Amino acid sequence: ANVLMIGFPGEGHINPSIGVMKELKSRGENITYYAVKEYKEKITALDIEFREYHDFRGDRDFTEMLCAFLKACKDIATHIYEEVKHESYDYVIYDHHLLAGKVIANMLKLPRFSLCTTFAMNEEFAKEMMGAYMKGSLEDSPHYEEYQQLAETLNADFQAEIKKPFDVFLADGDLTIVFTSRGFQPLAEQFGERYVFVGPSITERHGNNDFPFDQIDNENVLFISMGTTFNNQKQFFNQCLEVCKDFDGKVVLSIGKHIKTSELNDIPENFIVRPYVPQLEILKRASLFVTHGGMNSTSEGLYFETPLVVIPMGNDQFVVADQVEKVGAGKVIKKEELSESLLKETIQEVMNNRSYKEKAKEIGQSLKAAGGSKKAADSILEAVKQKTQSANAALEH
Ligand SMILES: O=c1ccn([C@@H]2O[C@H](COP(=O)(O)OP(=O)(O)O)[C@@H](O)[C@H]2O)c(=O)[nH]1
């Protein structure tokens, strides 16, 4: 079948969608993936028709974020529809957090599926998990009346079916694939059968082979990454250089793309410091993961039964951090308590710790049991089959 896929601008969005595209393609499907230019190689790598839309990141108040996401919906929906209108697609997949995806699905009159790369969210989750506060009342919010104008226009002119603010950021398809298990998902019981909890979507990405695996293959490996988004971090990597310099093995520091490695302090002789690592392959070989608590890093780590130390900074990280504390699989350091000493003690406590390893194994196994990129494909293709046979029953007119 012909599949329109519309991604969201961020690596933690794109990465889990790779497994599902790769599973769908190896089953006969031709895919057209829309993303921002940054992540092209990640899609070209799969041998999948790549296409672009304006990166709206390069251009925290709740009502402003609603309006930015509606401006972008309108631009993406217009741009993408202009290009796809004459093409023959059988269904659309899109990032749960990209409303334009649901709008494209409505303009093509096709079956659609959302991929949720965070925990599943309903009205019982705080705005703060999507990285927004309100100072006081919604009325006195600066973009309040703008939100009411744009939502209204997108409903009338774009079939955006926005009944509620949260519908801007949580765009349910006919199904919502969620990349966690009901086990790990807080308030799992509040999500019906249209939420398919498939756990993490793990498969070889391309770019991996450059890293020297032979240096870490028969060694203890401490892996550290604060993600792909939380910079302001040169301070923290400097602290990692001092805390871990006498580690008895290899320390793999992924510092991200906005900090030159020469801008840090002296690298000890036992460190491999890169802007980007093949995280899946590093986790395969890692004893311990010091992570920011990003949904994907956290659930990639547990998938490899890696005990964690989680230093959460923003967005959903507090909620995922707390889920790691809850299931026994790791230990959280609050930013306010972060110090070289407490970083060193926390790593020494969790390294090789029988109790953290057991609990990491349990939740790791809950997450694998959810069926992964494979389950995402069975569930989607089966929904498509039923709606095709349903709609293909135009043998009355
Ligand atoms: O050096 C790195 C750093 C990050 N990642 C990937 O980037 C994504 C980060 O998503 P997460 O939800 O953990 O954090 P965010 O960066 O979105 O805060 C994950 O799939 C990681 O495997 C990677 O491959 N190599």
CSV table of C-alpha atoms and ligand atoms in Angstrom, one decimal:
chain,number,residue,atom,x,y,z
A,1,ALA,CA,0.0,0.0,0.0
A,2,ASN,CA,1.0,3.7,-0.3
A,3,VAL,CA,1.8,5.3,3.1
A,4,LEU,CA,2.1,9.0,3.9
A,5,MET,CA,4.2,9.5,7.1
A,6,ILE,CA,4.5,13.0,8.7
A,7,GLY,CA,7.2,13.3,11.4
A,8,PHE,CA,7.8,15.9,14.2
A,9,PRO,CA,10.9,18.0,14.4
A,10,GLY,CA,13.0,16.2,17.1
A,11,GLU,CA,15.2,13.1,17.3
A,12,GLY,CA,13.2,11.5,20.1
A,13,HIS,CA,10.1,11.7,17.8
A,14,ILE,CA,11.9,10.4,14.6
A,15,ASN,CA,13.9,7.5,16.2
A,16,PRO,CA,11.0,5.3,17.3
A,17,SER,CA,9.2,5.8,13.9
A,18,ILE,CA,12.2,4.2,12.1
A,19,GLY,CA,11.4,0.7,13.5
A,20,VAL,CA,7.7,1.0,12.4
A,21,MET,CA,8.7,2.3,8.9
A,22,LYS,CA,11.3,-0.4,8.5
A,23,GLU,CA,8.7,-3.1,9.6
A,24,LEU,CA,6.0,-1.7,7.2
A,25,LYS,CA,8.4,-1.4,4.2
A,26,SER,CA,9.7,-5.0,4.6
A,27,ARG,CA,5.9,-6.0,4.3
A,28,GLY,CA,5.3,-4.4,0.9
A,29,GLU,CA,4.5,-0.8,1.9
A,30,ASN,CA,5.9,2.3,-0.1
A,31,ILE,CA,6.4,5.2,2.4
A,32,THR,CA,6.8,9.0,1.9
A,33,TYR,CA,8.2,10.5,5.2
A,34,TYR,CA,7.8,14.3,5.7
A,35,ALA,CA,10.4,15.7,8.3
A,36,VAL,CA,12.6,18.8,8.8
A,37,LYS,CA,16.0,18.7,7.0
A,38,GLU,CA,18.1,18.0,10.2
A,39,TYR,CA,16.8,14.4,10.3
A,40,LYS,CA,17.0,13.6,6.5
A,41,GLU,CA,19.9,11.1,6.7
A,42,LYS,CA,17.9,9.1,9.3
A,43,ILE,CA,15.1,8.7,6.8
A,44,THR,CA,17.3,8.5,3.6
A,45,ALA,CA,19.2,5.7,5.4
A,46,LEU,CA,16.1,3.5,5.3
A,47,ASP,CA,15.8,4.0,1.4
A,48,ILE,CA,12.4,6.0,1.9
A,49,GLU,CA,11.2,8.9,-0.1
A,50,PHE,CA,12.1,11.9,2.1
A,51,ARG,CA,10.4,15.3,2.0
A,52,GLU,CA,10.7,18.6,3.9
A,53,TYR,CA,8.5,21.2,5.7
A,54,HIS,CA,9.6,24.5,7.3
A,55,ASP,CA,11.5,23.8,10.7
A,56,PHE,CA,9.2,25.8,13.1
A,57,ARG,CA,11.8,25.4,16.0
A,58,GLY,CA,14.2,28.0,14.4
A,59,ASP,CA,11.1,30.1,13.8
A,60,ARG,CA,7.0,27.9,27.6
A,61,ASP,CA,3.8,30.0,28.1
A,62,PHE,CA,0.9,27.5,27.5
A,63,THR,CA,-1.3,29.7,25.3
A,64,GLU,CA,1.8,30.9,23.2
A,65,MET,CA,2.8,27.3,22.6
A,66,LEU,CA,-0.8,26.5,21.4
A,67,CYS,CA,-0.7,29.4,18.9
A,68,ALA,CA,2.9,28.5,17.7
A,69,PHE,CA,1.7,24.9,17.1
A,70,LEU,CA,-1.5,26.1,15.3
A,71,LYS,CA,0.6,28.5,13.1
A,72,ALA,CA,2.9,25.6,12.2
A,73,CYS,CA,-0.1,23.2,11.6
A,74,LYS,CA,-1.6,25.6,9.0
A,75,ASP,CA,1.8,26.0,7.2
A,76,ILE,CA,2.6,22.3,7.2
A,77,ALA,CA,-0.9,21.2,6.3
A,78,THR,CA,-1.0,23.7,3.3
A,79,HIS,CA,2.6,22.8,2.2
A,80,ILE,CA,2.2,19.0,2.4
A,81,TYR,CA,-1.4,18.9,0.9
A,82,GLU,CA,-0.1,21.1,-2.0
A,83,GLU,CA,2.4,18.3,-2.8
A,84,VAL,CA,0.4,15.1,-2.0
A,85,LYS,CA,-3.1,16.0,-3.3
A,86,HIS,CA,-2.6,14.1,-6.7
A,87,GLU,CA,-0.7,11.2,-5.2
A,88,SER,CA,-2.5,7.9,-4.4
A,89,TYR,CA,-2.1,7.1,-0.6
A,90,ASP,CA,-4.0,4.2,1.2
A,91,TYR,CA,-3.4,5.7,4.8
A,92,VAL,CA,-1.4,8.2,6.8
A,93,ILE,CA,0.9,7.7,9.9
A,94,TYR,CA,2.0,10.9,11.8
A,95,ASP,CA,3.6,12.0,15.1
A,96,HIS,CA,0.9,12.2,17.9
A,97,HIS,CA,2.3,15.7,18.7
A,98,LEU,CA,1.8,17.0,15.1
A,99,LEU,CA,-1.9,18.1,14.6
A,100,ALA,CA,-1.0,18.9,10.8
A,101,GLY,CA,-0.8,15.1,10.5
A,102,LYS,CA,-4.5,14.6,11.5
A,103,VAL,CA,-5.4,17.6,9.2
A,104,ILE,CA,-3.6,16.0,6.2
A,105,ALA,CA,-5.5,12.7,7.0
A,106,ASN,CA,-8.8,14.8,6.9
A,107,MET,CA,-7.9,16.5,3.5
A,108,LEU,CA,-7.0,13.1,1.8
A,109,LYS,CA,-10.1,11.4,3.5
A,110,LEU,CA,-7.9,8.4,4.6
A,111,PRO,CA,-7.5,6.1,7.6
A,112,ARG,CA,-4.8,7.5,10.1
A,113,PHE,CA,-2.5,6.4,13.0
A,114,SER,CA,-0.6,8.5,15.5
A,115,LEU,CA,2.8,7.5,17.0
A,116,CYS,CA,3.1,8.7,20.6
A,117,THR,CA,6.8,9.0,21.6
A,118,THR,CA,6.1,10.3,25.1
A,119,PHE,CA,3.9,8.6,27.8
A,120,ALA,CA,0.2,8.6,26.7
A,121,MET,CA,-1.5,11.8,28.0
A,122,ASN,CA,-5.2,12.6,28.7
A,123,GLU,CA,-6.8,15.6,30.6
A,124,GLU,CA,-5.4,14.2,33.9
A,125,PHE,CA,-1.7,15.1,32.9
A,126,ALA,CA,-0.2,18.6,33.8
A,127,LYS,CA,0.6,21.1,30.9
A,128,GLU,CA,4.1,21.0,32.5
A,129,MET,CA,4.9,17.5,31.0
A,130,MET,CA,4.7,19.2,27.5
A,131,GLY,CA,7.0,21.9,28.9
A,132,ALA,CA,4.4,24.7,29.6
A,133,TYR,CA,3.0,26.6,32.7
A,134,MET,CA,0.2,29.2,33.1
A,135,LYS,CA,1.2,32.2,35.5
A,136,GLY,CA,-2.5,32.6,36.5
A,137,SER,CA,-5.9,32.3,34.6
A,138,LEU,CA,-6.3,31.1,31.0
A,139,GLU,CA,-8.3,34.4,30.2
A,140,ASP,CA,-5.3,36.7,31.2
A,141,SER,CA,-2.9,34.5,29.2
A,142,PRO,CA,-1.4,36.8,26.4
A,143,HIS,CA,-2.2,34.5,23.4
A,144,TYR,CA,-5.7,33.5,24.8
A,145,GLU,CA,-7.8,35.3,22.2
A,146,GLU,CA,-5.2,34.4,19.4
A,147,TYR,CA,-5.7,30.6,20.4
A,148,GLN,CA,-9.6,31.2,20.1
A,149,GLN,CA,-9.1,32.8,16.6
A,150,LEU,CA,-6.6,30.1,15.1
A,151,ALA,CA,-8.5,27.1,16.6
A,152,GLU,CA,-11.7,28.5,15.1
A,153,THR,CA,-10.1,29.1,11.6
A,154,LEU,CA,-8.4,25.6,11.7
A,155,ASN,CA,-11.7,24.0,12.5
A,156,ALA,CA,-13.7,25.8,9.7
A,157,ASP,CA,-10.9,25.8,7.0
A,158,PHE,CA,-8.7,22.7,7.8
A,159,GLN,CA,-11.1,20.2,9.6
A,160,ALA,CA,-8.7,20.4,12.6
A,161,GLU,CA,-11.5,19.1,15.0
A,162,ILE,CA,-10.0,21.0,18.1
A,163,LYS,CA,-12.6,20.9,20.9
A,164,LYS,CA,-10.0,21.6,23.7
A,165,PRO,CA,-6.5,23.0,24.0
A,166,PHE,CA,-4.9,19.5,24.6
A,167,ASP,CA,-6.2,18.5,21.0
A,168,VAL,CA,-3.6,21.0,19.6
A,169,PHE,CA,-0.7,18.7,21.0
A,170,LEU,CA,-2.5,15.2,21.3
A,171,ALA,CA,-3.8,14.3,17.8
A,172,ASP,CA,-5.3,10.8,18.3
A,173,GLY,CA,-5.4,8.7,15.1
A,174,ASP,CA,-7.8,5.7,14.5
A,175,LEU,CA,-5.1,4.1,16.7
A,176,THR,CA,-2.4,5.7,18.9
A,177,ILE,CA,0.8,3.5,19.0
A,178,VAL,CA,2.5,4.3,22.3
A,179,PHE,CA,6.2,3.2,22.7
A,180,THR,CA,5.9,2.0,26.3
A,181,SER,CA,4.2,-0.9,28.1
A,182,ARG,CA,0.9,-0.5,30.1
A,183,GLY,CA,3.3,-1.6,33.0
A,184,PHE,CA,5.5,1.5,32.7
A,185,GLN,CA,2.7,3.9,31.6
A,186,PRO,CA,1.2,5.7,34.7
A,187,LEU,CA,-2.7,5.5,34.8
A,188,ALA,CA,-2.5,2.9,31.9
A,189,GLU,CA,-6.1,1.8,32.8
A,190,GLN,CA,-7.4,5.3,31.6
A,191,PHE,CA,-6.5,4.4,27.9
A,192,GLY,CA,-8.8,2.2,25.8
A,193,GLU,CA,-8.0,-0.4,23.1
A,194,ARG,CA,-7.3,2.4,20.5
A,195,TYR,CA,-4.1,3.0,22.5
A,196,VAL,CA,-1.7,0.2,21.5
A,197,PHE,CA,1.2,0.0,24.0
A,198,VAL,CA,4.0,-1.7,21.9
A,199,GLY,CA,6.9,-0.6,24.2
A,200,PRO,CA,10.2,0.8,22.7
A,201,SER,CA,10.8,0.6,18.9
A,202,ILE,CA,14.5,-0.6,18.6
A,203,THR,CA,16.3,-1.3,15.3
A,204,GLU,CA,19.7,-0.5,13.7
A,205,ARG,CA,19.9,3.1,12.6
A,206,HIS,CA,22.7,4.1,10.2
A,207,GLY,CA,25.7,6.3,11.1
A,208,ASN,CA,26.7,3.7,13.9
A,209,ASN,CA,29.8,2.5,12.1
A,210,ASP,CA,32.4,5.2,12.9
A,211,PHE,CA,32.4,4.6,16.6
A,212,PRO,CA,35.3,2.3,17.7
A,213,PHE,CA,33.3,-0.6,19.3
A,214,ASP,CA,36.7,-2.6,19.7
A,215,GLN,CA,37.7,-0.1,22.4
A,216,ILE,CA,34.6,-0.9,24.6
A,217,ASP,CA,33.7,-4.5,23.5
A,218,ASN,CA,35.4,-6.4,26.4
A,219,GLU,CA,35.3,-3.5,29.0
A,220,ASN,CA,33.0,-2.1,31.7
A,221,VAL,CA,31.2,0.9,30.0
A,222,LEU,CA,29.7,3.9,31.7
A,223,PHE,CA,27.5,5.8,29.2
A,224,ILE,CA,26.4,9.5,29.8
A,225,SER,CA,24.1,11.7,27.6
A,226,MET,CA,21.8,14.6,28.6
A,227,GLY,CA,19.9,14.2,25.3
A,228,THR,CA,19.5,16.2,22.1
A,229,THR,CA,17.8,19.3,23.4
A,230,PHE,CA,19.0,20.1,27.0
A,231,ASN,CA,22.2,22.1,26.4
A,232,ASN,CA,23.5,24.7,29.0
A,233,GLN,CA,25.5,21.5,29.9
A,234,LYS,CA,29.3,22.2,29.4
A,235,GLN,CA,29.2,22.7,33.2
A,236,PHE,CA,27.8,19.2,33.7
A,237,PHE,CA,30.2,17.4,31.2
A,238,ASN,CA,33.1,19.2,33.0
A,239,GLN,CA,31.7,17.6,36.3
A,240,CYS,CA,31.5,14.2,34.4
A,241,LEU,CA,35.3,14.5,33.4
A,242,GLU,CA,36.3,15.0,37.1
A,243,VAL,CA,33.8,12.4,38.7
A,244,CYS,CA,34.6,9.5,36.3
A,245,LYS,CA,38.3,10.0,35.4
A,246,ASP,CA,39.3,7.0,37.7
A,247,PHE,CA,36.5,4.7,36.4
A,248,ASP,CA,37.9,1.2,35.8
A,249,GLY,CA,36.9,0.9,32.1
A,250,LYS,CA,35.6,3.3,29.4
A,251,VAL,CA,33.4,6.4,29.8
A,252,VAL,CA,31.3,7.3,26.7
A,253,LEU,CA,30.2,11.0,26.8
A,254,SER,CA,27.7,12.2,24.2
A,255,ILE,CA,27.8,16.0,24.6
A,256,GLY,CA,25.4,16.9,21.7
A,257,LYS,CA,25.9,19.1,18.7
A,258,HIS,CA,26.1,22.6,20.2
A,259,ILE,CA,29.2,22.2,22.3
A,260,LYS,CA,32.7,21.6,20.7
A,261,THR,CA,34.6,18.9,22.6
A,262,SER,CA,37.7,21.3,22.8
A,263,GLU,CA,35.5,23.8,24.8
A,264,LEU,CA,35.5,21.3,27.7
A,265,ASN,CA,38.3,20.6,30.2
A,266,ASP,CA,41.0,18.0,29.7
A,267,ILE,CA,39.5,14.6,28.6
A,268,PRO,CA,40.9,11.8,30.7
A,269,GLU,CA,42.6,9.0,28.8
A,270,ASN,CA,39.6,6.5,29.5
A,271,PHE,CA,36.9,8.7,27.8
A,272,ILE,CA,35.3,8.6,24.3
A,273,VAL,CA,33.6,12.0,23.9
A,274,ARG,CA,31.5,12.6,20.8
A,275,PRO,CA,28.7,15.1,19.8
A,276,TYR,CA,26.6,12.0,18.7
A,277,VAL,CA,26.9,8.2,19.5
A,278,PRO,CA,25.0,5.2,18.2
A,279,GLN,CA,23.1,5.1,21.6
A,280,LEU,CA,21.5,1.7,20.9
A,281,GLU,CA,24.9,0.0,20.4
A,282,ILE,CA,26.5,1.8,23.4
A,283,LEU,CA,23.5,0.7,25.6
A,284,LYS,CA,24.0,-2.9,24.3
A,285,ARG,CA,27.5,-2.7,25.9
A,286,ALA,CA,26.8,-0.3,28.8
A,287,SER,CA,26.8,-1.3,32.6
A,288,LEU,CA,25.1,2.0,33.6
A,289,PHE,CA,23.4,4.9,31.9
A,290,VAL,CA,23.5,8.5,33.3
A,291,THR,CA,20.6,10.1,31.5
A,292,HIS,CA,18.4,13.3,31.5
A,293,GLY,CA,15.3,11.1,31.8
A,294,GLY,CA,14.2,11.7,28.2
A,295,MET,CA,11.4,9.2,27.4
A,296,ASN,CA,13.5,7.5,24.6
A,297,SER,CA,16.9,7.3,26.4
A,298,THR,CA,15.2,6.0,29.6
A,299,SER,CA,13.2,3.4,27.8
A,300,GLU,CA,16.1,2.5,25.4
A,301,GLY,CA,18.2,1.9,28.6
A,302,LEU,CA,15.6,-0.3,30.4
A,303,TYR,CA,15.0,-2.2,27.1
A,304,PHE,CA,18.8,-3.2,27.5
A,305,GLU,CA,18.2,-3.9,31.2
A,306,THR,CA,20.6,-1.0,32.0
A,307,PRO,CA,20.3,0.4,35.5
A,308,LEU,CA,20.0,4.3,35.3
A,309,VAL,CA,21.0,7.4,37.2
A,310,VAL,CA,18.5,10.0,35.9
A,311,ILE,CA,19.1,13.8,36.3
A,312,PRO,CA,15.8,15.3,35.0
A,313,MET,CA,15.8,18.9,33.7
A,314,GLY,CA,12.5,19.6,31.9
A,315,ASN,CA,9.3,18.5,30.0
A,316,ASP,CA,8.2,14.9,30.7
A,317,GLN,CA,11.6,14.1,32.3
A,318,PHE,CA,10.2,14.5,35.9
A,319,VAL,CA,7.3,12.1,35.2
A,320,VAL,CA,9.7,9.5,33.5
A,321,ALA,CA,12.3,10.0,36.3
A,322,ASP,CA,9.5,9.2,38.9
A,323,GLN,CA,8.5,6.1,36.9
A,324,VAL,CA,12.2,4.9,37.1
A,325,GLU,CA,12.3,5.6,40.9
A,326,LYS,CA,8.8,3.8,41.2
A,327,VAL,CA,9.8,0.5,39.3
A,328,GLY,CA,13.2,0.2,41.2
A,329,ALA,CA,15.4,0.4,38.0
A,330,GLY,CA,17.4,3.5,38.9
A,331,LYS,CA,18.1,6.5,41.2
A,332,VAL,CA,17.1,10.2,40.5
A,333,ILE,CA,19.3,13.3,41.3
A,334,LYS,CA,17.4,16.6,41.5
A,335,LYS,CA,19.2,19.4,39.6
A,336,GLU,CA,19.1,21.3,43.0
A,337,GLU,CA,21.1,18.5,44.7
A,338,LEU,CA,23.5,17.8,41.7
A,339,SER,CA,27.2,18.0,42.9
A,340,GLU,CA,30.4,16.0,41.8
A,341,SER,CA,30.2,14.1,45.2
A,342,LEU,CA,26.5,13.1,44.9
A,343,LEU,CA,27.0,12.3,41.1
A,344,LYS,CA,30.1,10.0,42.1
A,345,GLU,CA,28.2,8.4,45.1
A,346,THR,CA,25.0,7.7,43.0
A,347,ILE,CA,27.1,6.1,40.2
A,348,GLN,CA,29.1,4.0,42.7
A,349,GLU,CA,25.9,2.9,44.5
A,350,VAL,CA,24.1,1.8,41.2
A,351,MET,CA,27.1,0.3,39.3
A,352,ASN,CA,26.9,-3.5,39.6
A,353,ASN,CA,24.1,-3.1,42.3
A,354,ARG,CA,22.1,-6.4,42.3
A,355,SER,CA,18.7,-4.7,43.2
A,356,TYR,CA,18.9,-2.0,40.4
A,357,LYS,CA,20.0,-4.7,37.8
A,358,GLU,CA,17.0,-7.0,38.8
A,359,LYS,CA,14.5,-4.1,38.6
A,360,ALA,CA,16.0,-2.9,35.3
A,361,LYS,CA,15.6,-6.5,34.0
A,362,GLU,CA,11.9,-6.7,35.1
A,363,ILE,CA,10.8,-3.3,33.6
A,364,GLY,CA,13.1,-4.1,30.6
A,365,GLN,CA,11.1,-7.3,30.1
A,366,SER,CA,7.7,-5.6,30.5
A,367,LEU,CA,8.8,-3.2,27.7
A,368,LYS,CA,10.0,-6.0,25.4
A,369,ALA,CA,6.8,-8.1,26.0
A,370,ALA,CA,4.8,-5.2,24.4
A,371,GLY,CA,5.9,-6.5,21.0
A,372,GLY,CA,7.9,-3.5,19.6
A,373,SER,CA,8.0,-2.2,16.0
A,374,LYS,CA,6.5,-5.6,14.9
A,375,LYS,CA,3.4,-5.1,17.1
A,376,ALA,CA,3.0,-1.5,15.8
A,377,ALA,CA,2.9,-3.0,12.2
A,378,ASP,CA,0.4,-5.9,12.9
A,379,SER,CA,-2.0,-3.4,14.7
A,380,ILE,CA,-1.8,-0.7,11.9
A,381,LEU,CA,-2.0,-3.2,8.9
A,382,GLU,CA,-5.0,-5.0,10.6
A,383,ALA,CA,-6.9,-1.7,11.2
A,384,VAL,CA,-6.2,-0.8,7.5
A,385,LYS,CA,-7.4,-4.2,6.3
A,386,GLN,CA,-10.7,-3.9,8.2
A,387,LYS,CA,-11.4,-0.3,6.9
A,388,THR,CA,-10.3,-1.3,3.3
A,389,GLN,CA,-12.8,-4.4,3.3
A,390,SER,CA,-15.3,-2.0,5.0
A,391,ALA,CA,-14.8,0.8,2.4
A,392,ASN,CA,-14.1,-1.7,-0.5
A,393,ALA,CA,-17.7,-2.7,0.1
A,394,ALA,CA,-18.9,-0.2,-2.5
A,395,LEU,CA,-20.4,-3.3,-4.2
A,396,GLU,CA,-23.9,-1.9,-3.6
A,397,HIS,CA,-23.7,1.3,-5.7
B,1,LIG,O1,24.4,10.7,21.2
B,1,LIG,C1,23.2,10.4,21.1
B,1,LIG,C2,22.2,11.1,21.8
B,1,LIG,C3,20.8,10.8,21.6
B,1,LIG,N1,20.5,9.8,20.8
B,1,LIG,C4,19.1,9.5,20.6
B,1,LIG,O2,18.3,10.7,20.7
B,1,LIG,C5,17.0,10.3,21.2
B,1,LIG,C6,16.7,11.3,22.4
B,1,LIG,O3,15.4,11.2,22.9
B,1,LIG,P1,15.0,11.5,24.4
B,1,LIG,O4,13.6,11.3,24.4
B,1,LIG,O5,15.9,10.6,25.2
B,1,LIG,O6,15.5,13.0,24.7
B,1,LIG,P2,15.4,14.5,24.0
B,1,LIG,O7,16.7,14.6,23.3
B,1,LIG,O8,14.2,14.4,23.0
B,1,LIG,O9,15.2,15.4,25.2
B,1,LIG,C7,17.0,8.9,21.6
B,1,LIG,O10,16.3,8.0,20.6
B,1,LIG,C8,18.5,8.5,21.6
B,1,LIG,O11,18.8,7.1,21.3
B,1,LIG,C9,21.5,9.2,20.0
B,1,LIG,O12,21.3,8.3,19.2
B,1,LIG,N2,22.8,9.5,20.2
